[PDB]
Amino acid sequence: GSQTFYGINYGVNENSCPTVDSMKNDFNVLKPYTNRVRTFALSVCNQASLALAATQALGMRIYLGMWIDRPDTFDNEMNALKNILANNDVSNVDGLIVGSEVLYRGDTDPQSLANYIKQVKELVAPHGIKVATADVYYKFPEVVVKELDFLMMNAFPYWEGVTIDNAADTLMSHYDQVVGASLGKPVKISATGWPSAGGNFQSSVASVENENKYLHDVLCRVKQRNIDLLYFSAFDEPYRGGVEAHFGVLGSDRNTKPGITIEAGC
Ligand SMILES: OC[C@H]1O[C@@H](O[C@@H]2[C@@H](O)[C@H](O[C@@H]3[C@@H](O)[C@H](O)O[C@H](CO)[C@H]3O)O[C@H](CO)[C@H]2O)[C@H](O)[C@@H](O)[C@@H]1O
Numbered sequence: 132g133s134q135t136f137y138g139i140n141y142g143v144n145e146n147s148c149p150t151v152d153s154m155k156n157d158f159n160v161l162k163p164y165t166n167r168v169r170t171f172a173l174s175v176c177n178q179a180s181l182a183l184a185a186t187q188a189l190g191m192r193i194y195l196g197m198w199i200d201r202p203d204t205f206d207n208e209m210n211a212l213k214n215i216l217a218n219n220d221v222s223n224v225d226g227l228i229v230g231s232e233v234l235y236r237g238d239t240d241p242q243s244l245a246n247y248i249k250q251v252k253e254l255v256a257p258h259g260i261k262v263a264t265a266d267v268y269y270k271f272p273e274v275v276v277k278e279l280d281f282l283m284m285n286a287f288p289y290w291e292g293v294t295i296d297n298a299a300d301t302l303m304s305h306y307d308q309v310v311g312a313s314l315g316k317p318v319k320i321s322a323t324g325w326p327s328a329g330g331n332f333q334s335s336v337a338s339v340e341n342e343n344k345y346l347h348d349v350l351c352r353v354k355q356r357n358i359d360l361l362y363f364s365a366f367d368e369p370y371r372g373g374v375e376a377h378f379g380v381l382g383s384d385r386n387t388k389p390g391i392t393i394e395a396g397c
Contacts, residue, residue, distance in 0.1 A: 135350070135393055138167030138194065139380070140322060140364040141182075147370075148176035154185035160385050161365060164393055166191050169321070169361050171231065172198035174211035183219050194321075194361065196228040196265075197251070200238055205247060212251070216258065226261045227251065228321065232285060234270040241272045248278040265321040268305040271312040283321035284309045292333035295341045298325070299348035306358070323349060324363035327388065329374035337374065339390035346380070351396030 139161060143149065149157070158168065168186065170193070173179040179195055186193050195215075197208045215221065229248050233239060244264070252262045261280040268286055276282065286305045288298040302323055309318050325345035326337040346362075353360045367379035367388075382388050 132163055132393065133166060135395060136165040136167075136362055137353075137359050138169055138361040139165050140361055141168045141170055142364055142366070142368050143170065143172075143176050143178050144368070144370055145175050148178075149181070151181050151184050154181055155188065157365070157385070158185055158189055158191060160381060162189065162191070164380075167193065167225065167361075168365075169194040169196060169228075171196045173208050173215065179211070179215055180219060183215070183221070183223075187220060187223055192223045192225050194226050194228060195224055197230060199230045199233060199247070200236075209250070212254065216254070221258055221260065224260055226263055226281070227255055228283060229262060229264050231265045231321070232267065232270075233264070234272075234275075235267045241274050245274045245278050248275070252278065252280075263319070263321075268308045271309060273312075273314070276312060276314050276316070279316060281317040281319060282309055282313055283319050285322040286320070287323060289325055289332060289335045289337075292335055294334045295325075295336060295344055298335075298345055299352050302349060303352055303356075319359040319361075320353070321361050322363045323360070324378050326374050327367075327377040327391075329377055332374075337377065339388065342377075343391050346391070347394065347396035350394075354395055354397065 170178050170182050182193060199205055199208060229251050233244055248262060263279055263281045263283045265283040265285055268284055271282060284306060286302055288301045293301050325342045327339045327342040329337045331337060364378050366381055367377055367383040369376050369383050380391065
């Protein structure tokens, strides 16, 4: 069952950082289901350096995310990238994800993002690392895509008000649009998921039974079409409040969630 998930998203609490030994215990819970994890920032909590050490000791692999937001984060993260290359073995890195939903939020303009991606590529290419960015299905303009090695989609049919029976179909439909803007380059999925509690969003109902169905349906759909997927997410994060606190495959205390069975729908 170690090949059920291609990979899983791993959240970090910025107000209460983990340690190397802490991450190792966390990744051991996931090891029967997966061999890959993904982190969202480099310098915050020194998480990249610690996750590189944790995964390498357990024979697992990793996607490294760069968190770019306000003007400061461009310089701050680039300097942290430089330090990783000088201080760490990076042979188990499957890719570097420059920003998550940068264009959706309106943090910078398409040309500025395109230029920043080029600087990153010039640095990591000699180490044989591939570059991407992650955003919503309708935010992949040609100027950005030209600088990429591959594309990564974030899509959540729950926030769109789509019913559970149609949810996986909509995801695949959104995937086709990204391919339409891909210029022929590989397209992966960096985040999708479904909440187990917190109420509803229009016709989208949050329940344990619905998260279980969504998990099964999405895993089948990606296996049929040979799409690489990073599922969202590993553990429930209570410090996020409401709906955002129930996206985990397993519980916040690291035990399993009753009603969730970890398997693909086909
Ligand atoms: O740790 C670095 C950085 O983390 C930021 O919080 C991120 C969230 O932005 C992210 O949000 C998810 C989206 O990426 C995804 O598309 O949708 C889901 C469901 O709506 C979102 O939860 O989640 C990750 C993992 O929990 C967080 O690390 C902080 O905002 C930022 O302050 C911090 O620097």
